[PDB]
Amino acid sequence: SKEYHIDEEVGFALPNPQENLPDFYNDWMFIAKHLPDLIESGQLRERVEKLNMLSIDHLTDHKSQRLARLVLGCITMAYVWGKGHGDVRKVLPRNIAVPYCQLSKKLELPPILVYADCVLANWKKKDPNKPLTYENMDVLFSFRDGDCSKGFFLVSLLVEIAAASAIKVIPTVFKAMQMQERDTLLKALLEIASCLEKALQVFHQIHDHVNPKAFFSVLRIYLSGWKGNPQLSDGLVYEGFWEDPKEFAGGSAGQSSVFQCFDVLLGIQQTAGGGHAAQFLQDMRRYMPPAHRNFLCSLESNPSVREFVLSKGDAGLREAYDACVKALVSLRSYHLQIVTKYILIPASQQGGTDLMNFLKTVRSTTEKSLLKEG
Ligand code: HEM
Ligand SMILES: O=C(C[C@H]1c2c(F)cccc2-c2cncn21)C1CCCCC1
């Protein structure tokens, strides 16, 4: 690990995100910081239409470009979805479409709000001298009062951070395989397994800070994109940048690099085959930051832990390897239950089976990677 932009303490998330942009962009940040009130009063759309076209030249360093991608992506969701009741904008105005697209191509991400914007760069500690717990943290932007974006974003972030403790171990895994250092490889695999077990505890916080009706009827609407979306059949037009409408996927934790990297690490071939699930997870790698995508490619080019463990006729190693797969299955089983409570039951009024089918395919693939199981 070196220039993969992966942090010791926080992993794939952006370390200590910038909260303020240069004063040259106070007109962007007034809108982003007040979307609850501006959306509800119906003045957001006119306020975005009335901004001038601001250059991206004053965004000098990485952290300010990431805040700007966050700021404009939030304004774009609000502009396109309005008050999230089904009356949508097919055109994004030039004054915000051009700088958003220019900044996006600079950072090699699509001009739509992605996971690495609203989770990995969308947080702050309340008091720097205290640890990274939900109580000492907060998001930087929200769409609507009571949309539960703080719970949803922050709990995803804390899971991402939990798993980041196991990322540190990955160089130990490959150095041990290369040097045939068997004892330290088994220690490495169980260390990876206990971090993934700790991350499962973090998942329980979702029930405390997100409620299903707000998630389903509100936050879901603002996280949606325009790829195969019937509300914008042809996609969104980026006035002044592409003449024709263009389709980009809405936010999806397939764009989280941390579960994709453990799939790669353990040889669970989630992107193998022609199926829709593999097709989808591969395409979501284009919505990850290039440093993290390059990291995934880098693990896929290392020797297979899985084939190393199978070739050695060593139970101890096989149990440690299964301890990691079991942790992943446990995570994905608990998360399928979240989705039953937060999407399936609300959708029937306390599409949906396409999502459940997707997650069960991923979990199935994972389950079938267990070794002396069957
Ligand atoms: C209210 C809570 C949640 C709901 C309703 C929910 C729902 C979903 C749905 C419907 C998908 C598949 C659709 C898609 O990604 O396009 C998905 C994928 C995924 N989600 Fe969540 N999720 C929630 C919480 C979380 C949290 C806190 C994490 C922590 C990082 C997470 C991690 C993932 C991952 C890694 C995937 C990719 C598929 C996989 O690796 O199994 N989810 N989620
Ligand atoms: O996958 C996602 C959203 C995605 C997401 C974000 F877009 C931003 C922050 C966290 C997540 C997240 C966590 N699990 C799925 N997702 C939606 C897909 C459509 C049904 C609602 C859930």
Swiss-Prot record:
* UniProt-annotated location(s): Cytoplasm, Cytosol
- Per the entry, what modulates this protein's activity? Activity is inhibited by and MTH-trp (methylthiohydantoin-DL-tryptophan), modestly inhibited by L-1MT (1-methyl-L-tryptophan) but not D-1MT (1-methyl-D-tryptophan).
Q: Name the Enzyme Commission number(s) assigned to this protein.
A: 1.13.11.52
The record's annotation in Gene3D superfamilies points to: 1.20.58.480
Q: In which tissues is it expressed?
A: Expressed in mature dendritic cells located in lymphoid organs (including lymph nodes, spleen, tonsils, Peyers's patches, the gut lamina propria, and the thymic medulla), in some epithelial cells of the female genital tract, as well as in endothelial cells of term placenta and in lung parenchyma. Weakly or not expressed in most normal tissues, but mostly inducible in most tissues. Expressed in more than 50% of tumors, either by tumoral, stromal, or endothelial cells (expression in tumor is associated with a worse clinical outcome). Not overexpressed in tumor-draining lymph nodes.
- Tell me one GO biological process term: response to lipopolysaccharide
Annotated Gene Ontology cellular components are: cytoplasm; cytosol; smooth muscle contractile fiber; stereocilium bundle
Q: Name one GO molecular function term.
A: tryptophan 2,3-dioxygenase activity
**Anything else known:** IDO1 is the target for therapy in a range of clinical settings, including cancer, chronic infections, autoimmune and allergic syndromes, and transplantation. IDO1 and IDO2 are 2 distinct enzymes which catalyze the same reaction. IDO2 affinity for tryptophan is much lower than that of IDO1. 50% of Caucasians harbor polymorphisms which abolish IDO2 enzymatic activity. IDO2 is expressed in human tumors in an inactive form: tryptophan degradation is entirely provided by IDO1 in these cells. IDO2 may play a role as a negative regulator of IDO1 by competing for heme-binding with IDO1. Low efficiency IDO2 enzymes have been conserved throughout vertebrate evolution, whereas higher efficiency IDO1 enzymes are dispensable in many lower vertebrate lineages.
State the family it belongs to. Belongs to the indoleamine 2,3-dioxygenase family.
Subunit-level organization: Monomer.
What is the protein's name according to its record?
Indoleamine 2,3-dioxygenase 1
Name the lineage.
Answer: Eukaryota, Metazoa, Chordata, Craniata, Vertebrata
Gene designation per UniProt:
IDO1
